[PDB]
Amino acid sequence: SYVSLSGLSAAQLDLNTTSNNIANANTYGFKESRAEFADVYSNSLFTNAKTTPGGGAQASQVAQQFHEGSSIYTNNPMDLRVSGTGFFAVAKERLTP
Protein backbone atom coordinates (compact mmCIF):
# COMPACT_ATOMS: atom_id res chain seq x y z
CA SER A 1 0.00 0.00 0.00
CA TYR A 2 2.96 2.28 0.62
CA VAL A 3 4.27 1.63 -2.90
CA SER A 4 0.87 2.66 -4.26
CA LEU A 5 1.08 5.79 -2.11
CA SER A 6 4.49 6.55 -3.62
CA GLY A 7 3.04 6.09 -7.10
CA LEU A 8 0.14 8.41 -6.32
CA SER A 9 2.50 11.04 -4.94
CA ALA A 10 4.75 10.84 -8.00
CA ALA A 11 1.79 11.13 -10.38
CA GLN A 12 0.41 14.09 -8.41
CA LEU A 13 3.82 15.78 -8.54
CA ASP A 14 3.91 15.28 -12.31
CA LEU A 15 0.41 16.78 -12.54
CA ASN A 16 1.56 19.78 -10.50
CA THR A 17 4.61 20.27 -12.72
CA THR A 18 2.49 20.16 -15.89
CA SER A 19 -0.08 22.55 -14.40
CA ASN A 20 2.67 24.99 -13.43
CA ASN A 21 4.09 24.74 -16.95
CA ILE A 22 0.68 25.46 -18.50
CA ALA A 23 -0.06 28.39 -16.18
CA ASN A 24 3.23 30.03 -17.20
CA ALA A 25 2.40 29.75 -20.92
CA ASN A 26 2.06 33.54 -21.19
CA THR A 27 4.92 34.79 -19.00
CA TYR A 28 8.07 36.00 -20.77
CA GLY A 29 11.28 34.03 -20.29
CA PHE A 30 9.80 31.00 -18.56
CA LYS A 31 11.45 27.61 -18.99
CA GLU A 32 9.42 24.43 -18.80
CA SER A 33 9.97 21.87 -16.05
CA ARG A 34 10.28 18.10 -16.39
CA ALA A 35 9.57 15.58 -13.63
CA GLU A 36 12.11 12.76 -13.28
CA PHE A 37 11.60 9.60 -11.23
CA ALA A 38 13.76 6.73 -10.02
CA ASP A 39 13.07 3.29 -8.63
CA VAL A 40 13.25 2.69 -4.87
CA TYR A 41 14.77 -0.65 -3.62
CA SER A 42 16.20 -1.25 -0.09
CA ASN A 43 17.61 -4.56 1.30
CA SER A 44 19.07 -5.58 4.72
CA LEU A 45 21.36 -8.41 5.85
CA PHE A 46 18.29 -10.37 7.03
CA THR A 47 15.94 -9.90 4.00
CA ASN A 48 15.77 -12.76 1.50
CA ALA A 49 17.05 -11.39 -1.81
CA LYS A 50 16.12 -12.83 -5.23
CA THR A 51 12.61 -11.81 -4.08
CA THR A 52 12.91 -8.00 -4.00
CA PRO A 53 9.43 -6.51 -4.36
CA GLY A 54 10.76 -3.02 -5.16
CA GLY A 55 10.31 -0.14 -2.77
CA GLY A 56 8.06 1.86 -5.09
CA ALA A 57 8.71 5.03 -7.10
CA GLN A 58 10.73 8.00 -5.85
CA ALA A 59 10.67 11.49 -7.32
CA SER A 60 14.22 12.42 -8.33
CA GLN A 61 14.05 16.15 -9.12
CA VAL A 62 12.00 18.67 -11.08
CA ALA A 63 14.24 19.72 -13.96
CA GLN A 64 14.37 23.21 -15.47
CA GLN A 65 14.95 22.44 -19.17
CA PHE A 66 16.54 25.51 -20.77
CA HIS A 67 15.72 25.09 -24.45
CA GLU A 68 15.42 28.38 -26.32
CA GLY A 69 11.89 29.72 -26.64
CA SER A 70 10.34 31.58 -29.50
CA SER A 71 10.30 35.34 -29.79
CA ILE A 72 7.60 37.96 -30.19
CA TYR A 73 8.06 41.51 -31.46
CA THR A 74 7.09 44.72 -29.70
CA ASN A 75 8.94 47.31 -31.81
CA ASN A 76 10.05 48.90 -28.52
CA PRO A 77 13.78 49.47 -27.88
CA MET A 78 13.49 48.96 -24.11
CA ASP A 79 12.55 45.31 -24.74
CA LEU A 80 15.62 43.12 -25.22
CA ARG A 81 16.13 39.46 -26.07
CA VAL A 82 19.22 37.29 -25.66
CA SER A 83 19.59 35.27 -28.87
CA GLY A 84 21.30 32.05 -27.82
CA THR A 85 22.91 31.24 -24.48
CA GLY A 86 23.22 33.99 -21.90
CA PHE A 87 21.43 35.72 -19.03
CA PHE A 88 20.78 39.26 -17.91
CA ALA A 89 22.18 40.46 -14.59
CA VAL A 90 19.77 42.37 -12.35
CA ALA A 91 20.66 43.73 -8.91
CA LYS A 92 18.03 44.16 -6.20
CA GLU A 93 19.82 47.26 -4.90
CA ARG A 94 21.18 50.02 -7.14
CA LEU A 95 24.35 50.53 -5.07
CA THR A 96 25.46 46.95 -4.44
CA PRO A 97 26.48 45.04 -7.60
Binding site: S1, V3, S4, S6, G7, A10, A11, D14, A35, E36, F37, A38, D39, V40, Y41, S42, A49, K50, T51, T52, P53, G54, G55, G56, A57, Q58, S60, Q61, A63, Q65, H67, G84, T85
Partner: protein, 262 residues
Protein backbone atom coordinates in the same frame (compact mmCIF):
# COMPACT_ATOMS: atom_id res chain seq x y z
CA UNK B 1 -2.62 -26.41 14.57
CA UNK B 2 -4.10 -27.56 11.27
CA UNK B 3 -2.19 -28.33 8.04
CA UNK B 4 -4.61 -26.27 5.95
CA UNK B 5 -3.72 -23.23 8.08
CA UNK B 6 -0.01 -23.38 7.24
CA UNK B 7 -0.62 -24.26 3.58
CA UNK B 8 -3.01 -21.33 3.14
CA UNK B 9 -0.62 -18.99 4.96
CA UNK B 10 1.97 -19.57 2.24
CA UNK B 11 -0.73 -18.77 -0.30
CA UNK B 12 -1.42 -15.42 1.35
CA UNK B 13 2.30 -14.64 1.70
CA UNK B 14 2.95 -15.54 -1.95
CA UNK B 15 0.12 -13.36 -3.26
CA UNK B 16 1.17 -10.41 -1.10
CA UNK B 17 4.62 -10.40 -2.68
CA UNK B 18 3.05 -10.76 -6.13
CA UNK B 19 0.71 -7.82 -5.47
CA UNK B 20 3.60 -5.81 -4.01
CA UNK B 21 5.55 -6.66 -7.17
CA UNK B 22 2.74 -5.37 -9.39
CA UNK B 23 2.19 -2.32 -7.18
CA UNK B 24 5.82 -1.32 -7.74
CA UNK B 25 5.42 -1.80 -11.50
CA UNK B 26 2.50 0.64 -11.46
CA UNK B 27 4.43 3.17 -9.37
CA UNK B 28 7.34 3.20 -11.83
CA UNK B 29 5.20 3.70 -14.92
CA UNK B 30 6.78 7.10 -15.68
CA UNK B 31 10.35 6.29 -14.62
CA UNK B 32 12.76 6.61 -17.54
CA UNK B 33 14.57 3.36 -18.30
CA UNK B 34 12.64 1.16 -15.87
CA UNK B 35 12.34 -2.59 -16.43
CA UNK B 36 9.24 -4.32 -15.10
CA UNK B 37 9.55 -7.31 -12.71
CA UNK B 38 7.51 -10.55 -12.80
CA UNK B 39 6.74 -12.83 -9.80
CA UNK B 40 7.51 -16.49 -10.18
CA UNK B 41 5.39 -18.93 -8.18
CA UNK B 42 6.49 -22.44 -7.27
CA UNK B 43 5.04 -25.04 -4.93
CA UNK B 44 6.78 -26.15 -1.75
CA UNK B 45 7.97 -29.58 -0.63
CA UNK B 46 5.47 -32.44 -0.45
CA UNK B 47 4.81 -34.55 2.64
CA UNK B 48 5.30 -38.20 1.69
CA UNK B 49 2.52 -40.03 3.51
CA UNK B 50 2.22 -42.89 1.00
CA UNK B 51 5.00 -43.19 -1.57
CA UNK B 52 3.74 -43.08 -5.18
CA UNK B 53 5.17 -46.06 -7.01
CA UNK B 54 5.56 -48.05 -3.80
CA UNK B 55 5.09 -51.82 -3.51
CA UNK B 56 1.52 -52.62 -2.48
CA UNK B 57 2.20 -56.31 -3.18
CA UNK B 58 4.16 -58.55 -5.52
CA UNK B 59 3.26 -57.93 -9.18
CA UNK B 60 1.50 -54.66 -8.27
CA UNK B 61 2.30 -51.14 -7.15
CA UNK B 62 0.63 -47.96 -5.97
CA UNK B 63 -0.11 -45.97 -9.16
CA UNK B 64 -0.58 -42.70 -7.28
CA UNK B 65 0.34 -42.09 -3.66
CA UNK B 66 -0.75 -39.81 -0.84
CA UNK B 67 1.51 -36.74 -0.90
CA UNK B 68 0.35 -33.45 0.62
CA UNK B 69 1.88 -30.21 -0.60
CA UNK B 70 3.10 -27.51 1.77
CA UNK B 71 1.77 -24.55 -0.23
CA UNK B 72 3.48 -22.12 -2.59
CA UNK B 73 5.90 -19.21 -2.51
CA UNK B 74 7.38 -16.54 -4.75
CA UNK B 75 10.88 -17.82 -5.49
CA UNK B 76 12.06 -14.82 -7.53
CA UNK B 77 11.01 -11.42 -8.86
CA UNK B 78 12.36 -11.68 -12.40
CA UNK B 79 13.27 -8.50 -14.28
CA UNK B 80 12.07 -8.29 -17.89
CA UNK B 81 14.89 -6.46 -19.67
CA UNK B 82 13.10 -5.64 -22.92
CA UNK B 83 13.44 -2.25 -24.55
CA UNK B 84 10.85 0.41 -23.80
CA UNK B 85 9.57 2.95 -26.28
CA UNK B 86 11.47 6.07 -27.34
CA UNK B 87 10.64 9.65 -26.37
CA UNK B 88 11.96 12.59 -28.39
CA UNK B 89 13.11 15.53 -26.27
CA UNK B 90 14.63 18.95 -26.91
CA UNK B 91 17.40 18.47 -24.34
CA UNK B 92 20.82 17.62 -25.78
CA UNK B 93 22.18 15.92 -22.64
CA UNK B 94 19.72 13.01 -22.39
CA UNK B 95 20.56 9.93 -24.46
CA UNK B 96 18.99 6.55 -25.16
CA UNK B 97 20.74 3.23 -25.72
CA UNK B 98 19.14 1.78 -28.86
CA UNK B 99 19.80 -1.87 -28.07
CA UNK B 100 21.82 -3.76 -25.50
CA UNK B 101 24.08 -1.94 -23.06
CA UNK B 102 24.12 0.18 -19.91
CA UNK B 103 25.57 3.57 -19.06
CA UNK B 104 28.23 3.52 -16.34
CA UNK B 105 28.60 5.95 -13.43
CA UNK B 106 30.96 6.27 -10.47
CA UNK B 107 29.32 5.62 -7.12
CA UNK B 108 30.43 7.57 -4.03
CA UNK B 109 31.80 4.37 -2.49
CA UNK B 110 34.09 4.01 -5.51
CA UNK B 111 32.58 1.14 -7.47
CA UNK B 112 30.98 1.63 -10.89
CA UNK B 113 27.20 1.54 -11.14
CA UNK B 114 25.24 0.81 -14.30
CA UNK B 115 22.08 2.59 -15.43
CA UNK B 116 19.63 2.53 -18.33
CA UNK B 117 18.21 6.00 -17.61
CA UNK B 118 19.61 8.70 -19.87
CA UNK B 119 18.65 11.89 -18.00
CA UNK B 120 22.10 13.45 -17.58
CA UNK B 121 23.30 16.98 -16.84
CA UNK B 122 26.45 18.88 -15.89
CA UNK B 123 27.98 19.90 -12.58
CA UNK B 124 29.84 23.12 -11.79
CA UNK B 125 33.03 21.85 -13.41
CA UNK B 126 31.19 20.94 -16.62
CA UNK B 127 31.72 17.20 -16.11
CA UNK B 128 28.76 15.12 -17.26
CA UNK B 129 26.80 13.76 -14.27
CA UNK B 130 23.36 12.25 -13.72
CA UNK B 131 20.31 14.44 -13.16
CA UNK B 132 19.48 12.79 -9.83
CA UNK B 133 22.13 12.24 -7.16
CA UNK B 134 24.73 13.68 -9.54
CA UNK B 135 27.05 10.70 -9.98
CA UNK B 136 29.80 11.30 -12.57
CA UNK B 137 29.50 9.31 -15.80
CA UNK B 138 32.36 6.93 -16.70
CA UNK B 139 34.52 7.92 -18.52
CA UNK B 140 34.50 11.56 -17.36
CA UNK B 141 33.24 13.88 -20.10
CA UNK B 142 34.21 17.51 -19.47
CA UNK B 143 32.40 20.07 -21.63
CA UNK B 144 34.66 23.11 -22.20
CA UNK B 145 33.29 26.50 -21.21
CA UNK B 146 33.86 27.70 -24.80
CA UNK B 147 31.39 25.16 -26.23
CA UNK B 148 28.41 26.55 -28.13
CA UNK B 149 26.68 23.18 -28.75
CA UNK B 150 26.94 19.52 -27.79
CA UNK B 151 26.57 16.61 -30.22
CA UNK B 152 26.79 12.92 -29.31
CA UNK B 153 27.21 10.56 -32.24
CA UNK B 154 26.01 7.01 -32.71
CA UNK B 155 29.39 5.65 -31.58
CA UNK B 156 29.23 7.63 -28.33
CA UNK B 157 31.71 10.31 -29.43
CA UNK B 158 30.83 13.52 -27.57
CA UNK B 159 31.74 16.60 -29.62
CA UNK B 160 31.35 20.34 -29.09
CA UNK B 161 31.54 23.38 -31.35
CA UNK B 162 33.81 26.31 -30.48
CA UNK B 163 32.90 29.77 -31.73
CA UNK B 164 35.07 30.98 -34.60
CA UNK B 165 36.45 27.51 -35.33
CA UNK B 166 35.36 24.82 -37.77
CA UNK B 167 35.41 21.05 -37.11
CA UNK B 168 34.05 19.33 -33.99
CA UNK B 169 36.55 19.28 -31.12
CA UNK B 170 36.15 15.85 -29.52
CA UNK B 171 35.85 16.13 -25.73
CA UNK B 172 35.51 12.45 -24.84
CA UNK B 173 34.19 9.00 -25.65
CA UNK B 174 31.20 7.31 -24.01
CA UNK B 175 31.43 3.58 -23.33
CA UNK B 176 28.49 1.31 -22.51
CA UNK B 177 28.63 -2.07 -20.79
CA UNK B 178 26.68 -5.21 -21.69
CA UNK B 179 25.74 -8.23 -19.58
CA UNK B 180 24.88 -11.75 -20.68
CA UNK B 181 22.00 -11.91 -18.16
CA UNK B 182 20.71 -8.40 -17.34
CA UNK B 183 18.08 -9.99 -15.08
CA UNK B 184 20.75 -11.00 -12.57
CA UNK B 185 21.71 -7.40 -11.80
CA UNK B 186 21.01 -6.23 -8.25
CA UNK B 187 19.00 -2.97 -8.29
CA UNK B 188 20.28 -0.55 -5.65
CA UNK B 189 17.71 2.15 -6.43
CA UNK B 190 18.21 5.40 -8.34
CA UNK B 191 17.91 3.44 -11.61
CA UNK B 192 21.28 1.81 -10.87
CA UNK B 193 22.36 -1.84 -10.96
CA UNK B 194 25.30 -3.71 -9.49
CA UNK B 195 26.71 -6.83 -11.19
CA UNK B 196 26.16 -10.07 -9.29
CA UNK B 197 27.29 -13.65 -9.84
CA UNK B 198 24.20 -14.46 -11.90
CA UNK B 199 24.67 -11.31 -14.00
CA UNK B 200 28.09 -12.26 -15.38
CA UNK B 201 31.33 -10.46 -16.07
CA UNK B 202 30.74 -6.96 -17.48
CA UNK B 203 31.91 -6.52 -21.07
CA UNK B 204 32.70 -2.98 -22.21
CA UNK B 205 33.11 -1.42 -25.63
CA UNK B 206 32.19 1.46 -27.90
CA UNK B 207 28.42 1.80 -28.44
CA UNK B 208 27.04 0.65 -31.78
CA UNK B 209 29.83 -1.91 -32.22
CA UNK B 210 30.61 -5.37 -30.84
CA UNK B 211 26.91 -6.07 -30.31
CA UNK B 212 26.33 -3.04 -28.09
CA UNK B 213 23.50 -0.60 -28.66
CA UNK B 214 23.68 2.85 -30.21
CA UNK B 215 23.63 6.15 -28.31
CA UNK B 216 20.66 8.23 -29.46
CA UNK B 217 21.12 11.82 -28.30
CA UNK B 218 18.10 13.91 -27.28
CA UNK B 219 16.07 10.75 -26.71
CA UNK B 220 14.82 8.78 -23.71
CA UNK B 221 13.64 5.23 -23.02
CA UNK B 222 10.28 5.05 -21.28
CA UNK B 223 9.33 2.34 -18.82
CA UNK B 224 8.35 -0.98 -20.38
CA UNK B 225 5.51 -1.70 -17.94
CA UNK B 226 2.16 -2.60 -19.50
CA UNK B 227 -0.56 -1.05 -17.33
CA UNK B 228 -3.12 -3.39 -18.91
CA UNK B 229 -1.16 -6.44 -17.74
CA UNK B 230 -0.58 -5.07 -14.24
CA UNK B 231 -4.26 -4.27 -13.68
CA UNK B 232 -5.40 -7.66 -14.98
CA UNK B 233 -2.77 -9.45 -12.89
CA UNK B 234 -3.90 -7.37 -9.90
CA UNK B 235 -7.45 -8.74 -10.16
CA UNK B 236 -6.31 -12.36 -10.46
CA UNK B 237 -3.87 -11.98 -7.56
CA UNK B 238 -6.69 -10.59 -5.41
CA UNK B 239 -9.05 -13.46 -6.23
CA UNK B 240 -6.42 -16.06 -5.30
CA UNK B 241 -5.79 -14.05 -2.13
CA UNK B 242 -9.46 -14.15 -1.12
CA UNK B 243 -9.91 -17.85 -1.88
CA UNK B 244 -6.91 -18.62 0.33
CA UNK B 245 -8.52 -16.64 3.16
CA UNK B 246 -11.63 -18.81 2.79
CA UNK B 247 -9.68 -21.92 3.81
CA UNK B 248 -8.31 -20.14 6.88
CA UNK B 249 -11.83 -18.88 7.59
CA UNK B 250 -13.22 -22.40 7.10
CA UNK B 251 -10.56 -24.03 9.29
CA UNK B 252 -11.20 -21.42 11.98
CA UNK B 253 -14.90 -22.33 12.00
CA UNK B 254 -14.04 -26.04 12.15
CA UNK B 255 -11.66 -25.58 15.08
CA UNK B 256 -14.27 -23.44 16.82
CA UNK B 257 -16.83 -26.21 16.27
CA UNK B 258 -14.53 -28.90 17.69
CA UNK B 259 -13.87 -26.81 20.80
CA UNK B 260 -17.62 -26.52 21.43
CA UNK B 261 -18.30 -30.23 20.76
CA UNK B 262 -15.21 -32.28 21.63
Amino acid sequence: MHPALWVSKTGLDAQQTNIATISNNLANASTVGYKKSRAVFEDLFYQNINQPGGQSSQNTELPSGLMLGAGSKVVATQKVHTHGNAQTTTNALDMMVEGDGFFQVTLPDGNIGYTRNGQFTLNGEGTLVTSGSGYPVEPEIVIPEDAISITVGTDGEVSVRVRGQQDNQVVGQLTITDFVNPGGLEPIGQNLYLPTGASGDPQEGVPGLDGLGEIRQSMLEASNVNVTEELVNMIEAQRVYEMNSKVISSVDKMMSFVNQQL
